[PDB]
Amino acid sequence: GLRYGKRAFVYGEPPFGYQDILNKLEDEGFPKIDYKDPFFSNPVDLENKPYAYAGKRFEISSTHVSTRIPVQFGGETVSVYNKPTFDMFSSWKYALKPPTYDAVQKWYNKVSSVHDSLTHLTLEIHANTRSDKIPDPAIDEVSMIIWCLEEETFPLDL
Amino acid sequence: MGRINNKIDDISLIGRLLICGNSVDFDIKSVNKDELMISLTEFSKFLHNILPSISVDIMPGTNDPSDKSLPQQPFHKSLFDKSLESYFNGSNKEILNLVTNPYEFSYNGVDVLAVSGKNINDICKYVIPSNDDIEHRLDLMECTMKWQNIAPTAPDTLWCYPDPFVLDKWPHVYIVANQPYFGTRVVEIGGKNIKIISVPEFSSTGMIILLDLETLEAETVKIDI
Amino acid sequence: KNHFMGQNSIFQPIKFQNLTRFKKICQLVKQWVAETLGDGGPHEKDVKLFVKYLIKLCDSNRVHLVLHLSNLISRELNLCAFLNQDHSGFQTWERILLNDIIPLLNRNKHTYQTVRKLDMDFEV
Amino acid sequence: RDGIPAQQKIIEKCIRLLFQTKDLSKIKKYLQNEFFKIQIGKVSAQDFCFAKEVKLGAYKSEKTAPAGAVVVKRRINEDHRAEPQYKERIPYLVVKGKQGQLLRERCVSPEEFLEGENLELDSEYYINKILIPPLDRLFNLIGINVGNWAQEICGEELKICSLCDDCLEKRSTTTLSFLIKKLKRQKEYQTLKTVCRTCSYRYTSDAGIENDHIASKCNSYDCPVFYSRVKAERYLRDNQSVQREEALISLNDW
Amino acid sequence: MDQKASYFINEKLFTEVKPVLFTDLIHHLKIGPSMAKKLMFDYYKQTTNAKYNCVVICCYKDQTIKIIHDLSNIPQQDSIIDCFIYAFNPMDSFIPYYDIIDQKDCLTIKNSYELKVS
Amino acid sequence: LHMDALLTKFNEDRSLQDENLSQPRTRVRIVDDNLYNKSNPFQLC
Amino acid sequence: NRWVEKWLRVYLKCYINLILFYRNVYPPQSFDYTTYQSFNLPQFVPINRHPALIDYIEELILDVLSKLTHVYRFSICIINKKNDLCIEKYVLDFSELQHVDKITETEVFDEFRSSLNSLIMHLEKLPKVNDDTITFEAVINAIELELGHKLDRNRRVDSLEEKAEIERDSNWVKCQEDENLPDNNGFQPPKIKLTSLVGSDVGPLIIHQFSEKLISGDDKILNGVYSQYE
Amino acid sequence: MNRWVEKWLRVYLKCYINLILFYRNVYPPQSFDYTTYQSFNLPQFVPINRHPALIDYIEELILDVLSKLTHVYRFSICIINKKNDLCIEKYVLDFSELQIITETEVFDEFRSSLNSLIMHLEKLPKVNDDTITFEAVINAIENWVKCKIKLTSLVGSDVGPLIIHQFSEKLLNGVYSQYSIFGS
DNA sequence: CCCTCCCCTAC
C-alpha cells in the first residue's frame, strides 16, 4: 500500500462505521432517509411569503444556489462583509461541466359434444325516418333487420 | 450561360428555362419564416444571376409554399429579393413569368402541358392489387392520357373549385416533375401524337432535360457534385 | 462605459502612419512591400518606422499580430518569386525580414501578469 | 365521472410530476401553460364535456333538476322520441354567458355547441370551477394554493394597434408567415380528411370518389378526429382566414 | 492580362480566405471564359506554395458534368471533351457562397428580350 | 493519364476565340403565346 | 448595441460549433451541416443536434456577451479527459470590439465568413483526435470584474433577468494564466506553438484570432489522443 | 491577515472532508445534506452529514489540526480497504505557507481549489458499499499515534503567502465496480 | 353563511 510518510501521525479511528451510522442517526431522533420535500426549481416562484394552511406552517425552500444557506462551521454561518476588491487583468474559467462524449454518443444511438352453454341471438333494425326526427314506432316503418346467431355456442350445426 | 461547355452556338439554342417546381423543400409542421426567407433569398440570388442570360419560368411545387390543392396559383409577387423589383414591375413578364401548377405553354406555336407531379405521386401512393418502376410510371402516364383527365384521384389531388382538369385539347408534350426516374416516350392515340416526358428531381440524380422543339427530341445533361 | 476603458475602446490600438484598422495597415504594408521590390530597396526611415511599430506592438502583448505580419511578409516574398527574383530588391527585403523580424519574435513574453510559462518558437 | 376528462388528465399529470420530480416549479409551469391554452381556445373540445346520468322520473321539481336534465328536456321538446333510458349519461358543455346567469341556464349540448356559429366555451368558468377546487385540495396539504398561479396568467399581428390592419409593412416576412400558417392548416385538414377516408373505408370498401363524401358525413362525438376536423373547418371558414386572404391580396397588389 | 488576374487571385485566396471561381474573373476583368480558363492554367504552374486544392471538372461527350474527387482514376478518359480548373480551394471543403453580381456587360450570351423599366 | 496530363492536353491548347464579350450572340427568341392570352382554365380566384 | 450583440452571438456560436466538430470533442455523426440555427449563420457551420449541448452553448454565449464590456479576451481550452493538461488553446482576441452605444449585414457576414474559413483552414491541417478521449473548456480573460461574490447579500430573485444575472455571476471561478500547461519538467521541455489567423475587421466589430498548440511533450503528454501517426 | 486565513481554512477543510466522505463509500449516501447548503457560492451541491456526532468529530479534528498548523507539513485523507489495511487512495494537501493578503483573494483561491476537488471527484469510478474506511493523517515538520502511484495534481492557493498544494494518488480485490451519485 | 337536492365514490 501507499506509505504514510517519513514521519506521520495517525488520528483516532472514527466513532461510527458504514452500517452503524444509519442506526445511530435513527436512534439520535432523525429519520434514516431524508426524503426531499416539494421545492421550487427556480426561486422566482418562492414569492417570499409564508406558506401555511389551516394554521399549519409549511417550510418550502428552493434547491437553487441563490436561496441555499452557506455552509456553517460550529453552528455559525460564515460570509464576507467587506466589499470585494477586484484587481486588474484577472482570468476566469467556466465552472459547469459540459456534456460527456459517451452521453452524446448514446443519445445519437437511440435517436366436448355436450351442450353446456346458452344459444345466443342478436337483432338490429334500420328505420327510414323523415327529415331529422329519429326512428318512430308510430310513423316510421322498419326497413332492414340484421341477425347474427353466436356460432361459438350454437350446437346442432344445422 | 455557356461558361462551362464553351460551345456558344449550342448553348444559345436554349431559348427559355422552365423550373417545374419544388424549388424549396421544407416541413410545414415545424418551420420558421427566417429559414424560408433565407432559402427564398438564395433562389432570388440565383434568378437575378441567371435572368439576364436566359428567361426563367417559375412553377409551383408540392413542397413549395403554395396551395396544397393541385391547381396551385403562382408563387407570389413577393418572397423575392429587392433586386427583382425591375423584373416584377408588371410590364416585363416575358423573361420572368410565374404560372399556375397546370399550364399550357405555347412555346413557338407548340403547346406543352406541365404539372408539378402531385397527381402521379397520388396514384403511386395507392396500392392496387389488380395491375415503382420507370416502365410502370410510363404506363400510368399512358392511362392518365387515355382516361382524358389529369387527376384520376380527385380527393387526393384537388379540393373543390372556385372542371378544368377535364382535358379540352390534347397537348403536344406532357411534362411531369418530381419523379424518381426519367423516361421519354412518343405515343399515338386516335391518330394524334403526344410526347410524355418525366423530368427527374434535381436534389437527387440532378440531371436536366433539353427538349428540342424542331425535332421533338429530349436529351439529358447530368451534373455530378 | 464604466470609466475604465481609458480610450475610445477598451484598449488603445497601435497606430502607425495615422492608421488604426489592422486590415487597413496590413493592406498598406502589402502595398509598400509590393512597390518597394521594384525600387531596388526600401528606405531606411521606413524600415526604422516599421521596426519601431513592431517593437511597440510587441510591448503591448500582441505577438499574434506580429506573427501575422511576419507571415504576410513571408507569403508576399514567396509569391513574388520566379517573377521578381534577383533584381536587388528581393535579396535585401529577405535579409531585412529575417534580421529585423525573426529575432524580434521571441522577445517580451508578457501577458499583463508575470511571464508566460514555457516558451514558443512560432509557426512563422 | 362527475367531471371532465381534461381535469382528470391535468390532475393525474400534476400528481405524477409532484410524486416523481417533487418540483413545484414544473407543476406551476405546466398549469400556466394549460390555463393559457384553455383561455386561447386550442383545446380538443372533447375532454371538456360532462357525463352525468339523469333520472327523469326521480326529480322532486324542475328547479331541483340537474344540469343534464335541462338538456334532456330541451331535446325532448323538439322531438319526443329522444327520451334517454334510466340512469343514462347525457353529455353537455357550458358555453360563455352573461354575468349572473345560472349554470343550468346555458346547458349547451355538444350537438348545439359544435353547430353553433358563434358559441364559445366558458374558459373562465371551467378554469376556476373545475381546476381550482380539486388542485387546491390536492395541494393545500403542501402549503401552496393554485389560485395565485391561475390569477398570475385592431391588427392582424400582435404593433399594439394600427384597412389591412398592419402598421409595419414587412411584406417579405408577413406574406411568408401567412403562407406558413395557411400551409400548416391545409396540411392538417388534408391529413384529417385522409384519416377519415381510411376510417370510412371499413363501410364504403372503396378509396375513390363517393367515399370521401361518406367520410365527411360522419359526425361521431366519441372520436377526437371528428372534433379536430370540425375545428379545422371552422378555422378555414372563420373571418380571420378571410382577413388573411385580404391582407395577402393587398400586399401582392404591387 | 497577366500580373493583374494573378494578383487578384492571390488576394482573394490569401488576403481573405475565400474560394475563387472563373465567374469571379468574368465579373472582374470582363473577359471571356476561355481567357479565364487559360489564366487558371497559367496560375496553376509557377507556384511553389501549394496552399490551395485545385478543383477540376470533366465535360463528357454526353455533357455529363462531373467533379473530380479522386484525381487518380477518372472513368471514360477518351470521352472527355473539355478539362479545366473549376476553382481554387484553400481547404478540402468547398461550400461556396453566392451573392449579387452586377453583370452589366460581362455576358457572353444575351437574351433577345431586353429589360424595360416604367 | 494523370490530372496534369489531361490539363496540359486540354486547357493548354485553348481556342481563345468567339469570346469577344463586346457583342454577345443573341439567344434564340422563344415566345409564349399564352403569356398575354389569359383565359387560363386552372386560374382560380 | 442591438445588431452588434446578435452578430457577436452568431459568430461565437459558429466558432464554438466549428471548434467542437473539427477537434473531435463530440462525435461527427451528431454534428450536421446546417445554415439555420434560429439565426442566419454566415456559412454552412455544422451545429450539433443535442438539446442539452445546444442549451449549454447558448447559455455560455449569452454569459460571455453579458460581460463583454469587461472581457477583452475569450478563449476555448481543450484539455485531455484522462489527465488535466491543456493540449490546445484557441483564443478569440477582442482587442477593441469598438464598444459604442450608437454597417449592414452583408459586410459583417462576409468578414465572419472569412474568419470562419481561415479557422477551418487551420483546423483541417491539424492531426485527427481519438474518440471519447478529449474535452473542451471555456476560459475568459477579464480586466476589472469579480465573479462569485454577488451571493453575499442573500438576494432574493423576483424576475428572470436578475436570477440569470445572479446565476452568471457565480458561474465562474478564479484561475491563473498558464495553469493547465505542463510545469516545465526540464527533460526536453514542451514548447507551445503559436499560429496567427485573420479576424473580422468590420466597422462596429474588430476581432483578432490566434491559436495555441503544444506540439511537444516529455512523455505522458499527448499520449493516445492523436490517433498515432494519422 | 491570519484571521481571514484561518476563518476560511476551517470552512474549506470542512467542505473538502465532507465532499471526500460523500463522493467515496466510507459512509453511505442519502445520509448527507446536499440540498440546503452551499460551500463557496458554487453552483455544485456540497453535501453535509446529517449526524451531529460525525460533524462534531470532523470539526474537532480540523480544529486540532489548525492548532498545530505551524508544526504540520502535510495533511491528507486516506482511503483504506477493509480486511486489507492498505491505503488505496490518498488525497494530500501539501503545506508550505510561511507565517497583507486580502480576504477576497483567499476566498477565490479556496473556491477554485474546491471546484477543482469537486471536478476531480466527479469522474472517479464507483465503489461498492461497506468496503472503505477513512483516516486522517498529518506529517510533522522536522489523539495522535506514531505510524505504484497515480498522482493527479490539483490547483491550490498561490495568491501570496498561502502555498497550499493539492494532489491525489490512487492504487484491492474487486472492490471497484462500475455503475449520477445525486440521483438517490 | 347554511340547508337541501343531486351526483359519485369507498367499505
Ligand code: SF4
Ligand atoms: S371521425 Fe373519427 S370516426 Fe368518423 S370517420 Fe373520421 S375518424 Fe372515423
